[PDB]
Amino acid sequence: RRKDALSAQRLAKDPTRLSHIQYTLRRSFTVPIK
Amino acid sequence: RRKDALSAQRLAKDPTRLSHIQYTLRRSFTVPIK
Amino acid sequence: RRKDALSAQRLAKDPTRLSHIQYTLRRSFTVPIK
Amino acid sequence: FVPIEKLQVNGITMADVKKLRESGLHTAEAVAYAPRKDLLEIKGISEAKADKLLNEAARLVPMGFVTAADFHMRRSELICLTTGSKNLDTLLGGGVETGSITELFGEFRTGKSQLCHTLAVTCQIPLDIGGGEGKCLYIDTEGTFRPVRLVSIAQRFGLDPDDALNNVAYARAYNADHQLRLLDAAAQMMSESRFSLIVVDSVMALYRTDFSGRGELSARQMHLAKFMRALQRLADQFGVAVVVTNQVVAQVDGGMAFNPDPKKPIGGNIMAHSSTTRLGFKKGKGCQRLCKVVDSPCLPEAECVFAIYEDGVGDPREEDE
Amino acid sequence: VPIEKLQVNGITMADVKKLRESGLHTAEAVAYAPRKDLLEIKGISEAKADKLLNEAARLVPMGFVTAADFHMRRSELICLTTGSKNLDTLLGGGVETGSITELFGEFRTGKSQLCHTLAVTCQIPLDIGGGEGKCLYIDTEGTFRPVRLVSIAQRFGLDPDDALNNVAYARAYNADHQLRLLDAAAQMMSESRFSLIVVDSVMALYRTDFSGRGELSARQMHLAKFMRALQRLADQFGVAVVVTNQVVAQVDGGMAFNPDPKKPIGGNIMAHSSTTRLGFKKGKGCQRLCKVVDSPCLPEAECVFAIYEDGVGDPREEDE
Amino acid sequence: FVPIEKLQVNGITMADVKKLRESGLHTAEAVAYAPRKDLLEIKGISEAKADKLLNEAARLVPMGFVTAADFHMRRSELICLTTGSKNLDTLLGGGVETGSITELFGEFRTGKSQLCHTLAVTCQIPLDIGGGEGKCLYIDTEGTFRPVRLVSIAQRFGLDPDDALNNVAYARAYNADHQLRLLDAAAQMMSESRFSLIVVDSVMALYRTDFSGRGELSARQMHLAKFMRALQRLADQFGVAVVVTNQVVAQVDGGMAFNPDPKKPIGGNIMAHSSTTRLGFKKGKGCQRLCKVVDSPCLPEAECVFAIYEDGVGDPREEDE
DNA sequence: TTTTTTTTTTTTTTTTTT
Ligand SMILES: Nc1ncnc2c1ncn2[C@@H]1O[C@H](COP(=O)(O)OP(=O)(O)OP(=O)(O)O)[C@@H](O)[C@H]1O
Ligand SMILES: Nc1ncnc2c1ncn2[C@@H]1O[C@H](COP(=O)(O)OP(=O)(O)OP(=O)(O)O)[C@@H](O)[C@H]1O
Ligand SMILES: Nc1ncnc2c1ncn2[C@@H]1O[C@H](COP(=O)(O)OP(=O)(O)OP(=O)(O)O)[C@@H](O)[C@H]1O
Ligand SMILES: [Mg+2]
Ligand SMILES: [Mg+2]
Ligand SMILES: [Mg+2]
Ligand SMILES: [Mg+2]
Ligand SMILES: [Mg+2]
Ligand SMILES: [Mg+2]
Ligand SMILES: [Mg+2]
């Protein structure tokens, strides 16, 4: 648990997480079945 | 079923379908009774 | 016991009480464990 | 409490004050607690004047936050009124608390009016013995008030019967509208002189007959809610202990067999939520009666036995055991 | 995020003080506020408002986030224990921060006792299930009792003096005062860390303040504004919010399907605004029944909890 | 669809493409459907350039008359998403329809959000079972999104929880302006990857409080109409299913007793006319729920019963009967 | 020096008796 788990500042201090989110959002769609 | 059934690209890629539509539109009216 | 214990006039007559309340409200949080 | 005369500052005229007093507002606390809409709907006050009045009232009396320790230490000095019975004092943790609504409900002949009569006398004895050192006010809706009991109880406590009778004010209501309107004169009377106790016996004596049928139920409930809210404002303003008596009704539909008692107080959710403390009364053997705490924000559920005698409400004797 | 971070790109301290006087205390509040309310502030121009909006949008993210990251973020949310194992099991660890929890039921159901227990337990360390923060209490019925807080803190081993000092209390006398107290609450929580907000009760004043069917719309809209402000405060500061509500018996027995003729006050606005709803009923002795009515992620079930001198707890074998 | 890059012909510069992308237009269909006024409002666009762009868009995208037989055989191949309940599936005639607007209205704890979650998770399964094979987009206005339900339902369908979570985009709106602005980002995102479902829960939540009083009713209705027009245009462009959630209020005017339901949805005439299909939800016994088709250009009026379990929405079981 | 045009758009429950 964290004092600021849902705080937006947590997203502001981690540009790498935002870059990963942006990369995952526009990655090509695939069938989610193994 | 098709992923782009209602896409305008389907109509644009088939000039024969458009020609058939134009031919059918201006064909003379007839009574639809057999 | 006082005839004007819960009366609002008691607090208005003691500005030091209000200043102490405001100072206590604004002091930083601490764990209430000895 | 702060008198309303202190409000005549920063362009406030005496005419505005007299209009407000005619409107039922007799103290600056009344102005502070009054909502903006109700203050504005009174004829003769402008919006800017109303805002100025609200700002002055906020300046005069505090309305902000406060630490819990200060509130606790302030509450620890609150005056509690003795009831003349040690068992009831132990059950209530000191006696009847001022500034809170206490309801006494039960069947007939259970002595609900006896406690009100006793409190009408015990509110004048000195503070050292659990008194209030203030006048009492009585509102009667059943024609049951009897000064003879007050004289006897004052004789029990050694107080002068003439002074005891002269220090209590009495009024009788004939309908719901008159019952509500009596509070307007009561506020002025308690503003002119110190009081400590208000008694209403009973709250729903007139409401049961004035409003009948399912169509009029909503109006009756709303009127009762307004009456209790006005009582809450009055108690907050003057800090006087308010005691109300209520009747009971038998539930014909015995679907809820879990409750062994088929009698419940009338009033419904409004009455249940409005009352701060609720005490149910039952008849025992002889003069003994059973008192039970039903709802209380700080007291546990328990029961006690108290006796009634010619001198008033007291602890049961070994002869009645 | 402090609002002082907005002191860039020509922003004057006078603008910051005007925003503070207007009730906005953090950059999140500025970001969430629409342009219309910013224009209503005296001394604010359209270009300045646009610059403020852009600066706020830069500081806090407002874009799209994948569901996995949101799930892993919510997995670390803080839940406050209620002192009862059954309640924790039903709520999956206790009350959830950042969401509105409503408790409704008739009188003598112990809602105020549960509120006191939550208020005291918000100060105990995290490893026990607390929140480690101050509590704020708004009372609309004059039923606050510090004695219960002292006793329950004695149960948990806290210092009564510190426990009383760490709890802020206020009382509202009308709807306007109740709404106005939120600005002071927001300022206090901006100046110091808080974890819990308790409102008991929401609908007490609205029953008498507004009269007749003619004023029903105004009352409902004022309640909607109050709940919108509460939700904005909750997701701005991340503190848990608990509200208590009363009940009313439905005279029309047309819907005989429901065995319970009592429904909470507030109607559709109250029902939709609250994130979670718990109904309370009285059992035998000190036992009480708690039932989950609405919850986006919890099934419908019931639990039994007892009230003792030390607060809300699990029922004992002696009560069975 | 047709990528906007095909417009880079006949003297159209790449800077014009950048301006169009910044203005919210991302596809050739967007240019074709846009009126002249909106194109002229874009800075740096000349009238001749706008005419050339319109001509090029019309050349690529056919916009003429089509015989009804071809339209019928085209619509016969639309993808319909299963809702996981055969009883509810039969009423919809195969499930929700892509390229159309479906609205769900009802009181609380009726399971609208659960159904939205089930559609959000079922749009990824292969279409031969009833899926859409595409990513889902979620816009939340009440802070009620719960990925745990998505994980559980994906476990029910034999889907990988990690990929199921990774294939869903989530966003939250804090005001009406932000909610409207999020559509630009959604359109930009869908222009790069294949999507099949868009859900808005709920449309009418923010507008109720953002706009105040009777005076601001017209502005609120205009903004709502603009938002629904944007949603319809987006659905036409990308051919994805659209689901919206609506709240309900009780009409105090009980003068008309013909309709036993005194509850009507929020939105006024704009919501009623804009939405293509409308479904009302009511609570049954236990976990069962009732669904009723209120408005539909093709489906007859009827009712259905479904249920909610830990794994999502489904057909009721005999145990619940 | 002349010489007017032309509507939009819904909110929102209360309350036991015997
Ligand atoms: N002078 C008296 N001396 C002794 N006991 C008395 C005296 N007067 C009344 N009582 C007792 O008190 C009872 C009535 O008390 P009281 O009027 O307070 O009851 P209650 O339950 O409040 O009544 P109600 O519902 O009619 O108001 C009598 O039945 C009797 O037992
Ligand atoms: N100190 C205490 N010890 C034990 N039980 C107590 C104590 N204080 C209160 N109670 C119990 O709690 C009940 C009232 O609790 P509480 O005020 O929280 O109820 P509530 O239903 O929320 O009431 P309200 O609607 O009046 O706010 C009492 O009737 C009693 O049974
Ligand atoms: N995991 C679960 N298992 C069983 N029932 C559940 C589960 N999660 C939620 N529910 C039930 O689903 C209902 C709530 O569903 P949902 O959140 O979709 O409500 P809604 O009527 O759409 O309201 P809202 O306006 O709050 O979104 C409640 O009856 C709740 O008990
Ligand atoms: Mg009698
Ligand atoms: Mg009597
Ligand atoms: Mg109570
Ligand atoms: Mg309570
Ligand atoms: Mg809900
Ligand atoms: Mg829902
Ligand atoms: Mg239609």
Residue numbers in the entry:
A (entry chain J), B (entry chain I), C (entry chain K): 103 to 136
D (entry chain F), F (entry chain D): 80 to 400
E (entry chain E): 81 to 400
Would you copy out the relevant sentences from the publication that reported this structure?
Rad51 is an ATP-dependent DNA-binding protein that forms extended right-handed helical filaments on the 3′ single-stranded DNA (ssDNA) overhangs that are formed following end processing of DSBs. The Rad51 presynaptic complex is responsible for identifying a homologous double-stranded DNA (dsDNA) sequence that can be used as a template to guide repair of the damaged DNA, and it catalyzes a strand invasion reaction where it pairs the bound ssDNA with the complementary strand of the homologous dsDNA, resulting in displacement of the non–complementary DNA strand. Rad54 binds to the Rad51 presynaptic complex, drives the ATP-hydrolysis-dependent movement of the presynaptic complex along dsDNA during the search for sequence homology, and it greatly increases the efficiency of Rad51-mediated strand invasion. Rad54 is a required cofactor for Rad51 strand invasion activity, therefore, Hed1 binding downregulates the activity of Rad51 in meiosis by preventing interactions between Rad51 and Rad54.
We obtained a 3.3 Å resolution CyroEM structure of an S. cerevisiae Rad51 filament bound to a 96-nucleotide ssDNA fragment in the presence of ATP along with a 44 amino acid peptide encompassing residues T101 to L144 from Rad54. Each Rad54 peptide interacts with a composite binding site formed by two adjacent Rad51 protomers within the nucleoprotein filament, corresponding to a buried surface area of 1651.4 Å2. The Rad54 peptide is composed of a N-terminal loop (amino acid residues R103 to A110), followed by a short helix (~1 turn; residues Q111 to D116), then another short helix (~3 turns; residues P117 to T126), and ends with a loop region (residues L127 to K136) that contains the FxxP motif and is located near the C-terminus of the peptide. Rad54 residues R103 to T126 interact with the Rad51 protomer facing toward the 3′ end of the ssDNA (shown in cyan) and residues R128 to K136 interact with the 5′ facing Rad51 protomer (shown in green). Rad51 residues V140 to V145 form a hydrophobic pocket at the Rad51 protomer–protomer interface which interacts with leucine residues L113, L120, and L127 and isoleucine residues I123 from the Rad54 peptide. Rad51 residues G209 to G213 form a second hydrophobic pocket which interacts with the FxxP motif of Rad54. In addition to these hydrophobic contacts, the basic residues K105, R112, R119, R128, and R129 from Rad54 form a network of electrostatic interactions with Rad51 residues E212, E156, D149, E271, and N246.
